[PDB]
């Protein structure tokens, strides 16, 4: 279903 695996790109929110 949809495209890819999961939701968004990466892990969490930000960079740190």
The residues of the shown chain that bind a copy of itself, judged by CB under 8 A, are 1-16
For the CB of residue 1, give the shortest distance to a copy of itself in the complex, in Å: 5
Between CA 2 and CA 6 the distance in angstroms is: 10
For the CB of residue 9, give the shortest distance to a copy of itself in the complex, in Å: 5
DSSP 16: -
For the CB of residue 10, give the shortest distance to a copy of itself in the complex, in Å: 2
């Amino acid at each position: 279903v949809g495209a890819x695996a999961x939701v968004x790109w990466x892990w969490x929110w930000x960079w740190x």
